[PDB]
Amino acid sequence: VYFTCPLTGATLRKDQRDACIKEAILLHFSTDPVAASIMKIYTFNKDQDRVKLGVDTIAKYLDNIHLHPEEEKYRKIKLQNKVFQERINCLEGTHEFFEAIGFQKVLLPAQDQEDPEEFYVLSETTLAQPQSLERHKEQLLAAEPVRAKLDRQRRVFQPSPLASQFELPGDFFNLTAEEIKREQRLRSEAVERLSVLRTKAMREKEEQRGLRKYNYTLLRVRLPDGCLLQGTFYARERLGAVYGFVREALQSDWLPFELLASGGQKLSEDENLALNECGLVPSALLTFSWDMAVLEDIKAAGAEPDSILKPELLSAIEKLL
């Protein structure tokens, strides 16, 4: 499965996504330190519940000094505060954000301890104009993690009749000693499994072995003109993204059509179901047909519907062998 890195445009595999995006965010600090630290807070940290609490606690510190900009006790954010330590100090990228939006990291004597404590102290340049922090606060709170976009890898194929021409050896149908002994052992084991007296826990331990193999799917569409349209989808993707994918591939993206699933169930564009709920994962072929309303006009006008896809995709058609 292939993805596009949102910050670079690079082509990556499923395992290479975090490595490239993280590097792009760390380099982005040379253009916009605030935007880079915002991406770093949401992207690097896997625990999004803590990230949401972290950025909300940062927003409160910024509004506190906004309400009382003349009081020095709101100008310094203590890094050892119970709420700061749990929500902000535990996340990667939160320190870079404070520096990016005008806070200096300093050590100040404590009111009751000899050891100096860590503070983020807002400079006079930014404190004089609260509008800067107010914009940076909204830029952090409205942000999302950076994740590589799934590459559809839109391709059209033309099957070659040569792939179906093959003859078997004369001994093909003569089974070996291992194949015959294995089959008889499976018959004896199947009778034994039906005879075994076991609890539900033992039954589930065996059944559960088939539950974890797939999270992506490859879909193909068989078109009336003999062409095959293929693309890549996430297991949780909705049926509406498949209709949008096909519409982009069609010569006429506006012309009504239906997609029929391999089990005989018609998939409607208005049905917001996931591909792993409709039985289209890890792979499936869909059957393409135009709506009957337009087919009646096409036939009545004497027009042969000899082209389904746009020439922009067909010029790159590959053969299947």
Binding site: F157, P161, A163, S164, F172, F173
Partner: peptide, 15 residues
Amino acid sequence: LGDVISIQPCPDVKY
């Protein structure tokens, strides 16, 4: 049942 057959995909099939 119990015999062996070969499976050969034939995507070239048309309507």
